[PDB]
Amino acid sequence: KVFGRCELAAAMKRHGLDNYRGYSLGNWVCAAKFESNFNTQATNRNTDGSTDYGILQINSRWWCNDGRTPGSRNLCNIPCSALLSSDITASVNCAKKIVSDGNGMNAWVAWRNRCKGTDVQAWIRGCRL
Numbered sequence: 001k002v003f004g005r006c007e008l009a010a011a012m013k014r015h016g017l018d019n020y021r022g023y024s025l026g027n028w029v030c031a032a033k034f035e036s037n038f039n040t041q042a043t044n045r046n047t048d049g050s051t052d053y054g055i056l057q058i059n060s061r062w063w064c065n066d067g068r069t070p071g072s073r074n075l076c077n078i079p080c081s082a083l084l085s086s087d088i089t090a091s092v093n094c095a096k097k098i099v100s101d102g103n104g105m106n107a108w109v110a111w112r113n114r115c116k117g118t119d120v121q122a123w124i125r126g127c128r129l
């Protein structure tokens with residue numbers, strides 16, 4: 001499913017992401033935009049053999065099992081395919097674990113390079129929530 005900007009902001013807010021660990025909603029919407037362009041089915045292969053999955057491009061090296069990432073961890077205890085569902089619950093629950101890892105949202109390269117330090121509130125402007 002390809003989410004609309006405000007549609008995703010509302011979905012994330014309902015799942016408890018607004019201000020989770022100090023990160024306002026605009027941060028999560030911005031990260032999703034540049035990581036997957038709001039597409040829950042986005043997948044991208046990395047050079048190390050791992051693969052990123054879903055709306056927030058969660059990596060198979062440490063967070064989910066996709067059966068083809070040798071010596072990887074499944075910290076979120078879920079098949080990576082689950083992160084491609086139209087229902088973002090799995091992605092949200094796993095992202096919460098990731099952001100608590102210690103490096104905050106810096107775990108998401110697109111967020112660090114394209115959202116961090118910008119006016120992220122702009123990503124939820126006009127939205128009804």
Ligand SMILES: [Cl-]
Nearest residue numbers: 022103104105
């Ligand atoms: Cl932080």
Ligand code: NA
Nearest residue numbers: 060064072073
């Ligand atoms: Na894994």
